[PDB]
Design a protein around this ligand. Structure first.
Ligand SMILES: [Mg+2]
Ligand SMILES: [Mg+2]
Ligand SMILES: [Mg+2]
Ligand SMILES: [Mg+2]
Ligand SMILES: [Mg+2]
Ligand SMILES: [Mg+2]
Ligand SMILES: [Mg+2]
Ligand SMILES: [Mg+2]
Ligand SMILES: [Mg+2]
Ligand SMILES: [Mg+2]
Ligand SMILES: [Mg+2]
Length: 231
RNA sequence: CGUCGUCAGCUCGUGCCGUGAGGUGUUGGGUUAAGUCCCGCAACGAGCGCAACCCCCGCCGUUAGUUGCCAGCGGUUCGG
């Protein structure tokens, strides 16, 4: 499932703005930039995917987090495709560590879908319609990929662990294992199942997250053919 | 009951940070009469306050016509 010229796709990036624990995943540094050893990326993609597989084939949830503008859209696609939750927009504080309270907000979200499907009163004032609807779009913006989470994920997949340090933090306090793609600006030891690759180029964000979702469906019940990628 | 003070404020739940007192939220940019609302945010909500719901005055309509009103008719002791 794994493919090999991801070299055409990413080979990583970032100049000495690096974290030095990431030393082991580096072949050399080129155009004043850290160049990620793909042979290591391989060793890892395997061991990571093995974990991913077992989790799919036991029907266990993955939380997908990415909000850096680059990996932003491709998590709505790729996660819906896996029929799994994600946070696309802002990563609210305490989503895992204070789950039940955050979710108490999704009941509100549902409750608006129900109320605003119609009618059960449109004899409520004009302002209130406006007010309530504005709220509705709101929850929808952050909470959309979140509602699929009815229980604490059995794992979480993150695009930038540095950028999503809070996320990795919340998981570790819960023992929720962490999967992440991570370029050279990252603390490796902080990840359980790790994908040492460029995390800023959508070429790469694409390949890795897709093949992830692919392995997710392929072992879950079915197989599928190409999914959406912006050029 | 006064007062600060009709001032925009004071807290809480759980989360997070801190050995701890405590912090966060309630800070921050814009806006408002206002913790008023907007956006941003390790917070996410909730409460007592703000506001709204009640009374008065301003415009209009309807229900009413006496003890109140008199526009036109008729009388009119000259006082609807
Ligand atoms: Mg980065
Ligand atoms: Mg607290
Ligand atoms: Mg201290
Ligand atoms: Mg503590
Ligand atoms: Mg406290
Ligand atoms: Mg205060
Ligand atoms: Mg305070
Ligand atoms: Mg302010
Ligand atoms: Mg005031
Ligand atoms: Mg308020
Ligand atoms: Mg705030």
């Amino acid at each position: 499932v794994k493919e090999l010229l991801e070299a055409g796709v990413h080979f990583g990036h970032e100049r000495k703005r690096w974290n030095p624990k990431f030393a082991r995943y580096i072949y050399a540094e080129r155009n004043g930039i850290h160049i990620i050893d793909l042979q290591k990326t391989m060793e890892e993609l395997e061991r990571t995917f093995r974990f991913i597989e077992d989790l799919a084939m036991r029907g266990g949830t993955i939380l997908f987090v990415g909000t850096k503008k680059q990996a932003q859209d491709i998590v709505r696609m790729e996660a819906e495709r896996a029929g799994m939750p994600y946070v696309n927009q802002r990563w609210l504080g305490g989503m895992l560590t204070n789950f039940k309270t955050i979710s108490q907000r999704v009941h509100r979200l549902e409750e608006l879908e129900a109320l605003f499907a119609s009618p059960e009163i449109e004899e409520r004032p004009k302002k209130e319609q406006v007010r309530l609807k504005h709220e509705l779009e709101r929850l929808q913006k952050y909470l959309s990929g979140f509602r699929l989470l009815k229980r604490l994920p059995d794992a979480i997949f993150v695009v930038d662990p540095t950028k999503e340090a809070i996320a990795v933090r919340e998981a570790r306090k819960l023992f929720i294992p962490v999967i992440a793609l991570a370029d050279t600006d990252s603390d490796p030891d902080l990840v359980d199942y790790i994908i040492p690759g460029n995390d800023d180029a959508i070429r790469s964000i694409q390949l890795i997250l897709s093949r992830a979702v692919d392995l997710i469906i392929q072992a879950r019940g079915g197989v599928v053919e190409p999914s959406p990628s912006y050029a």
